[PDB]
Amino acid sequence: VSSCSEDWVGYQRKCYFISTVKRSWTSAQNACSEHGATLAVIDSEKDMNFLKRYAGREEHWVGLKKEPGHPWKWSNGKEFNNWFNVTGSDKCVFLKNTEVSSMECEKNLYWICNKPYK
C-alpha cells in the first residue's frame, strides 16, 4: 500500500490534488470532501512555496476562509494565526506563483485539496 494515489502529488506527508476545472470555493470544498480531503491547509513555508510554484499563473482556491465576526479558520477547523499575509478583504483565499489573495467565494477558480499521507 502507498501513501497517496498515483494521480495525487505527495509532499511532506500530505497528498495534494490539483483540479483541472474551475468551480466556486464551496463546490471545490465539496469535491475535496468527496475524496477524504479538504481545500489545501498550509502548515509551513515549505508547503506554501511548493503550492505557489505549482499553482503557476492561475489562481487556485485553498482551505482558508474568513467570516466577519470569526477568526480566520482553516478547512480542518484549525484557527489560522496570520503567519502569511492575504491581500484584499474577500472571504475566500486563493494563491498563485506571485500572490496569496482573496476573491468572492462564488467565483470559479481552479483549486487544490490536501489530506494526510495514508
Residue 55 and residue 20 in contact, taking contact as beta carbons nearer than 8 Å: no
**Composition of the chain by helix, strand, coil, percent to 5:** 15, 30, 50
Query: Which residues between 56 and 85 bind Cl ion (CB under 5 A)?
Result: none
Q: CA-to-CA distance for 110 and 16, rounded, in angstroms?
A: 13
Tell me the three cell numbers of residue 110.
Answer: 481552479
Number of H helices, E strands in the chain: 2, 8
Pairing mode, if any, of strands 73-74 and 110-116?
unpaired
Subset of 18-37 contacting Cl ion (CB under 5 A): 19-22
From 28-36, 47-55, 69-77, 85-93, give the range in contact with a second copy by CB under 8 A.
47-55
82 interface partner picked from Cl ion, a second copy, none, CB below 5 to 8 A per type:
none
- Residue ranges in 50-109 that form contacts with a second copy under rule CB under 8 A: 50, 53-54, 56-57, 97
46 binds Cl ion (CB under 5 A): no
Q: What are the residues binding Cl ion (CB under 5 A)?
A: 19-22
Q: What are the residues binding a second copy (CB under 8 A)?
A: 2-4, 6-13, 50, 53-54, 56-57, 97, 117
